[PDB]
Write a protein that binds this ligand. Structure first.
Ligand SMILES: Nc1ncnc2c1ncn2[C@@H]1O[C@H](COP(=O)(O)OP(=O)(O)OP(=O)(O)O)[C@@H](O)[C@H]1O
Ligand SMILES: Nc1ncnc2c1ncn2[C@@H]1O[C@H](COP(=O)(O)OP(=O)(O)OP(=O)(O)O)[C@@H](O)[C@H]1O
Ligand SMILES: Nc1ncnc2c1ncn2[C@@H]1O[C@H](COP(=O)(O)OP(=O)(O)OP(=O)(O)O)[C@@H](O)[C@H]1O
Ligand SMILES: Nc1ncnc2c1ncn2[C@@H]1O[C@H](COP(=O)(O)OP(=O)(O)OP(=O)(O)O)[C@@H](O)[C@H]1O
Ligand SMILES: [Mg+2]
Ligand SMILES: [Mg+2]
Ligand SMILES: [Mg+2]
Ligand SMILES: [Mg+2]
Ligand SMILES: [Mg+2]
Ligand SMILES: [Mg+2]
Ligand SMILES: [Mg+2]
Ligand SMILES: [Mg+2]
Lengths: 228, 230, 230, 228
């Protein structure tokens, strides 16, 4: 049967993630150097709030979603499927389905919210990737993402205040000190989301936590959704 | 370090399709029974033309895109990456990236166009899946899709005329429409009966809707022209 | 170059299991209905002890091997790679390498031992498959294997006494042996009823056959002792 | 059901190769620097013939097998599954099954044949890996394998005739010329299998082709099994 051959051709890449373990989905903006060209540098409040609305929308429509992290143009989602013995998985842990629909959901909401304040902004697109993590690595994943957040934060602030040559090639600590003595800018005084991104947590409703801690010194902020 | 460790967890599902062979991407609307609940049944011209604009947008932005086929709420895209010896692959044939970005692109264009005439419509979403096919199965793929197009076409038309209980198979609902309701399915336009394709047309070049899209099973070269280069 | 191109085709199926989580490898004899056709039915002591020596050989040569379970012609191996923070993975958790080398090792030892007493026996072959499991499913895996061990055990014994047509389920063939043939299944030794495990025993250390291997469903710590390190 | 969960856990890595395209399996000896320590250097006739018997055994028991190539301690097998419209695949193109059983079959036959001439030789083990290739790349695969064969051949001959220091760091052409003027060894005069390995072809029976050509100048030697 032709339908039977095609079904096998399709099933050859019908990958499913193993169940009963943490699933991480990351959604990233495509060509967001071009897309955010024109936005307020180094940090656009309107753009960030559009991401946060997307994070909420994501957390609301994803089965098993427990925690959403945002920084720059990326969105990380922690998904668990082992709350109960009879807990089901989003799309039955189908890899291509989890990744594509997440990117779809993000795309739909982000473009809607952005074009409310910017009706002539070009279309925004996103990619999506899913994976699994052991329980003792979930907190580490977000710690990894927060460290990348701080590294990019400092660079973005130093880029919007100095020519490229000056920064080359300068450490994070250097650009931080140069921001202080030369521009009266104390990086530490910036709001949390600009320094290390923020998390969206269910409080029920999904809301932004502007007091999102440094996860490396408060791992339970993440692990409370990991070990149940 | 921690980043090295994290990089390996991610790479465990960094799947890549083997290169130099036909790639098929299918995009299907999520819960389009609810989303279309309010559209013109059995066939909505506004909704269909929103997919057609989406189909163009996809073909214009996908490296190696040769043909797009639309039917109902699904979009199949034929991608080839062996035109030359130096032909590169879209996202280097990364599985999760090809599927998601395709769904993202489809989502962006579709929602944009649909807002114009239907700003009250909720957000439309899509899923995406990618795969490879041997050269002598590409035509058979679209033939398989057209056969799924016709079976859905007859059911959609019949379910828009008769009651739920009153309606049997495809050959039954076809003559049930001819006799009982005096409606001829074979008289319907091409895109309603077996869907249509989107092909680059030359004049400069542009992606266009071909309403003279043939039955692939009776014209296999229509697809195979993009499958066999040399 | 050509090698770069070839390297990518191969890497399309260079699959790796995610690290820092339980790995299970199962090895199953190929066509062991024919290979064992000539052995002592229902249970052959020589054949079983050849698997036990194979099970030892596997555990001795597999990085992170914690427990091996034998039953019939299958061999399940529990591998952990998270003992320390610096624990490395066998073949870096390469799927095709873990499965094939396991099957190769099993093939080498088994054929060697079996030749000794049965040099007329044809070559024995095995397949191999690897996977991961969450920590709270490892015990459940072996429990699942022991439940498949008992159902096979009763059938093997019954099929060795009665005619093909004469034999119903497990509870039926169990009392059909007690009444009709006066044979008690529950009186049989452990390895025949529910298989056995191979665990490292301390005295120096060595892998040994534990004939006092309990029913895992009634003693989960027997397995979980290797699953949860801290 | 516990059996249903486990089945899903196992199916998470039940990978199948897409059908109706060339499948390549490569089997490689594990630790064959240690295993062949004691064998005749640079080329052991007995060891090579043991490989050839394995290649035959492989070609006889693998559904769809068309061509087997051997060099050093590796075995490459070309498998096709599109001879007819109703052609089936070995193990239904199950990846882990094709790779493991191939390595199993090789292991069984190789150890049997070797221990006929060397009953006290340690056990030999092998790994196995499978993949797909487009039709216009199959000939190139073996060309790639033959080029690696010649590269290793020259090095092995130069290693068994000179100390390590001398070779460092010398081209293939250099070691070839040094073999000539300094040891009266013309590499080109060596038998085919020592220079670039050989193929096992069905002639029916599977037999060694000691006249196996340089595939880069006779691609039809391979492509005759590719395009049918
Ligand atoms: N709040 C913000 N305001 C202004 N710009 C931002 C903001 N957040 C992120 N950006 C911009 O988004 C970009 C992120 O780039 P990234 O490294 O993700 O690659 P990209 O430009 O998105 O392209 P690709 O994702 O295809 O590699 C940065 O250049 C940064 O300037
Ligand atoms: N031109 C059109 N006009 C109106 N409705 C349409 C049109 N094309 C497709 N539809 C509707 O789209 C639906 C497609 O349903 P499908 O089988 O794809 O499942 P779904 O409802 O999309 O949910 P899911 O995709 O999650 O399975 C049909 O019910 C059909 O009524
Ligand atoms: N101790 C033993 N003595 C005799 N025979 C045994 C023993 N253990 C297992 N067997 C035999 O091994 C066979 C196992 O069959 P299994 O269900 O694994 O399929 P198979 O015959 O191995 O073929 P395949 O593995 O290709 O499916 C049984 O038929 C059983 O008779
Ligand atoms: N005919 C032969 N005679 C003597 N030695 C041989 C012969 N064929 C192959 N060898 C030896 O086999 C070895 C092949 O090594 P290879 O690069 O495959 O790694 P390996 O030693 O097999 O270990 P691993 O496969 O685990 O990396 C060479 O060192 C070579 O000396
Ligand atoms: Mg980006
Ligand atoms: Mg980014
Ligand atoms: Mg749909
Ligand atoms: Mg659909
Ligand atoms: Mg078996
Ligand atoms: Mg079995
Ligand atoms: Mg080797
Ligand atoms: Mg080798």
């Amino acid at each position: 049967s032709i339908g039977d051959r095609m079904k096998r051709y399709e099933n050859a890449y019908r990958i499913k993630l193993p169940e009963r373990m943490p699933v991480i989905v990351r959604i990233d903006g495509a060509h967001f150097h071009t897309y955010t060209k024109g936005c307020a540098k180094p940090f656009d409040q309107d753009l960030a709030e559009a991401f946060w609305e997307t994070c909420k929308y994501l957390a609301q429509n994803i089965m098993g979603a427990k925690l959403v992290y945002h920084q720059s143009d990326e969105i990380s989602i922690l998904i668990t499927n082992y709350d109960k013995l009879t807990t089901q998985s989003w799309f039955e842990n189908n890899l291509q389905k989890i990744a594509s629909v997440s990117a779809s959901m993000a795309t739909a909401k982000f473009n809607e919210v952005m074009r409310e304040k910017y009706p002539d902004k070009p279309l925004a697109t996103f990619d999506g990737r899913a994976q699994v993590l052991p329980q003792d690595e979930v907190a580490n994943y977000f710690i990894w993402r927060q460290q990348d957040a701080s590294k990019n934060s400092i660079s973005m602030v130093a880029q919007a205040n100095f020519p490229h040559k000056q920064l080359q090639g300068l450490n994070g600590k250097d650009m931080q000190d140069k921001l202080m003595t030369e521009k009266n800018i104390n990086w530490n005084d910036l709001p949390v989301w600009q320094k290390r991104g923020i998390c969206i947590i269910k409080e029920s409703r999904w809301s932004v936590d502007h007091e999102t801690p440094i996860i490396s010194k408060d791992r339970e902020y993440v692990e409370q959704f990991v070990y149940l």
